[PDB]
Design a protein around this ligand. Structure first.
Ligand code: CA
Length: 279
């Protein structure tokens, strides 16, 4: 399948070169997989989700996304126009308030929630969790991310936006999950992206168009935007049978475009997520 005039990040992850605008992907499109977006919520009524998104948990007075961030991330995973995996099932877990903030104890609870809740959902092709959030190092937060991964969920986490070594942020620094840095449309590391040996992969993160609350769209930047590209890619590859939750981060790194990014500090991987789709 081909989607013309796609957002640049979708085109980039199906391409060996920058500068194109068509997204190529297998029609299966993540059908039968599930992606949890652990964030500010998801505006499930947005036409772009087509009934495939549901809020399943909140830790606040409402499950509504009053911010937009979680809706944007969910859109990059799985909206019809702006998403990688256009037929996946999206589940929202609201661990961040409408200001985009959350206590670590609530974030931990949300991760352990997903490890259990996947047993309440039909996801025959596999389960992914996308965590576009983080803060300073916490062993308890890292341990929760490790548990979620251990339980059979592909965990993708944002590296962070301090232009610093990600070893000092959580859950970015947990080795067993898939830590995602951000790139721009000219294959430069995004200027804010964290780096370091704990990164596993880069994805598009500067000027990413996706869904927003109020039935709208907008373009924003962050490692928060790169992470759902990798989460959606994992769901897509799991539906195709190419990998599993335990193996997907390694598979994505093995099949990535190599050596194509600029301003990669020495010691950080030079790997850009790629779907290897050949029509
Ligand atoms: Ca890993």
């Amino acid at each position: 399948a081909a989607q013309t005039n796609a957002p640049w990040g979708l085109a980039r992850i199906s391409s060996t070169s920058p500068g194109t605008s068509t997204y190529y992907y297998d029609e299966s499109a993540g059908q039968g997989s599930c992606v949890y977006v652990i964030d500010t919520g998801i505006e499930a009524s947005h036409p772009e989700f087509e009934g495939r998104a549901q809020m399943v948990k909140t830790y606040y007075y409402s499950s509504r996304d009053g911010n937009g961030h979680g809706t944007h991330c969910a859109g990059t995973v799985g909206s019809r126009t702006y998403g990688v995996a256009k037929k996946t099932q999206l589940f929202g877990v609201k661990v961040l308030d409408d200001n985009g903030s959350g206590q670590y104890s609530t974030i931990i609870a949300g991760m352990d929630f997903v490890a259990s809740d996947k047993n309440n959902r039909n996801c025959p092709k596999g389960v992914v969790a996308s965590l576009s959030l983080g803060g300073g190092y916490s062993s308890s937060v890292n341990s929760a991310a490790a548990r979620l991964q251990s339980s059979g969920v592909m965990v993708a986490v944002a590296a962070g936006n301090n232009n610093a070594d990600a070893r000092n942020y959580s859950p970015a620094s947990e080795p067993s999950v898939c830590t995602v840095g951000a790139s721009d449309r000219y294959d430069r590391r995004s200027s804010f992206s964290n780096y370091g040996s704990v990164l596993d992969i880069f994805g598009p993160g500067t000027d990413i168009l996706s869904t927003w609350i109020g039935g709208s769209t907008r373009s924003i930047s962050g490692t928060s935007m790169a992470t759902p590209h990798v989460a959606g890619l994992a769901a897509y590859l799991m539906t195709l049978g190419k990998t599993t939750a335990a193996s997907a981060c390694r598979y994505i790194a093995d099949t990535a475009n190599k050596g194509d990014l600029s301003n990669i500090p020495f010691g950080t991987v030079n790997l850009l997520a790629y779907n290897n789709y050949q029509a």
